[PDB]
């Protein structure tokens, strides 16, 4: 009886993709000066590839939804080649021997620190936004793998506890079968889209992600706002007639 916003019915079948995360471990030992010109390098160069990781989700932002997201991605590029963010990492590196993962955790620490203090949900909300632009960073210094959700193949259901615009920006609308997230959001994004897309999904499923695992055989009804989990062929044998006959309707 999972209970959720319901977003737009569908009755749609498929397997389920549960995207987990490893917890980053960052570096907090104090490197030696003679390891110091190895951040920069790594950080420096490591500059050549996190933005080259956004360059190619900004494109992905306009030729999946329009140049009309895309120019919001693009101010997000400028924060991170911030000349002035930058002077800071460089600085802390070589007056406070931080390692290039810890120090560029510092000023990433107080600009989503910092907009908390706000009382907007707007810079609050960019907060995430920002943050999110910093798990980025770190996991380009540290070279630990991406979350690369736009590498489906066969056709699936997407289950997660919530996805951020940039996740939706590289996402695959061209396997994908719905989207199930725990976002009680009244106007989530994962929803926009499916608002925009007129696909069936939900938000509201709370803990479905700690009751679900991936490749699990799960069936969205999106018509009495439930979800089920391995259900009997007594039950899909009842509803693939009768939902079908609702494809007619």
Same mark, same amino acid.
């Given at each position: 009886? $999972?209970?959720?916003?319901?977003?737009?019915?569908?009755?749609?079948?498929?397997?389920?993709?549960?995207?987990? /995360?490893? #917890?980053?471990?960052?570096?907090?030992?104090?490197?030696?000066?003679?390891?110091?010109?190895?951040?920069?390098?790594?950080? !420096?160069?490591?500059?050549?590839?996190?933005?080259?990781? %956004?360059?190619?989700?900004?494109?992905?932002?306009?030729?999946?939804?329009? #140049?009309?997201?895309?120019?919001?991605?693009?101010?997000?590029?400028? %924060? !991170?080649?911030?000349?002035?963010? /930058?002077?800071?990492?460089?600085?802390?590196?070589?007056?406070?021997?931080?390692?290039?993962?810890?120090?560029?955790? /510092?000023?990433?620490?107080?600009?989503?620190?910092?907009? #908390?203090?706000?009382?907007?949900?707007? !810079?609050?909300?960019?907060?995430?936004?920002?943050?999110?632009?910093?798990?980025?960073?770190?996991?380009? $210094?540290?070279?630990?793998?991406?979350?690369?959700?736009?590498? $489906?193949?066969?056709?699936?259901?997407?289950?997660?506890?919530?996805?951020?615009?940039?996740?939706?920006?590289?996402?695959?609308?061209?396997?994908?079968?719905?989207?199930?997230?725990?976002?009680?959001?009244?106007?989530?994004?994962?929803?926009?889209?499916?608002?925009?897309?007129?696909?069936?999904? $939900?938000?509201?499923?709370?803990?479905?992600?700690?009751?679900?695992?991936?490749?699990?055989?799960?069936?969205?009804?999106?018509?009495?706002?439930?979800?089920?989990?391995?259900?009997?062929?007594?039950?899909?044998?009842?509803?693939?007639?009768?939902?079908?006959?609702?494809?007619?309707?």
């Amino acid at each position: 009886m $999972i209970s959720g916003i319901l977003a737009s019915p569908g009755i749609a079948f498929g397997k389920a993709l549960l995207l987990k /995360e490893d #917890e980053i471990v960052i570096d907090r030992k104090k490197i030696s000066a003679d390891q110091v010109d190895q951040e920069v390098e790594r950080f !420096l160069s490591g500059r050549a590839k996190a933005s080259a990781q %956004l360059e190619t989700i900004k494109t992905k932002a306009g030729e999946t939804f329009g #140049e009309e997201k895309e120019a919001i991605f693009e101010g997000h590029i400028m %924060l !991170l080649e911030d000349e002035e963010l /930058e002077q800071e990492i460089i600085a802390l590196i070589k007056d406070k021997h931080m390692t290039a993962d810890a120090a560029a955790h /510092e000023v990433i620490e107080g600009q989503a620190s910092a907009l #908390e203090e706000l009382d907007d949900e707007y !810079l609050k909300e960019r907060a995430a936004d920002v943050r999110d632009i910093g798990k980025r960073l770190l996991r380009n $210094i540290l070279g630990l793998k991406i979350i690369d959700l736009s590498a $489906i193949q066969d056709e699936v259901i997407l289950v997660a506890a919530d996805l951020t615009p940039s996740e939706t920006a590289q996402l695959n609308l061209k396997k994908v079968l719905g989207f199930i997230t725990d976002a009680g959001g009244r106007t989530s994004h994962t929803s926009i889209m499916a608002r925009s897309l007129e696909l069936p999904a $939900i938000v509201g499923t709370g803990s479905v992600t700690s009751q679900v695992k991936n490749d699990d055989y799960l069936i969205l009804d999106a018509v009495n706002n439930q979800v089920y989990v391995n259900p009997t062929n007594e039950v899909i044998d009842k509803m693939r007639a009768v939902q079908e006959q609702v494809a007619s309707e």
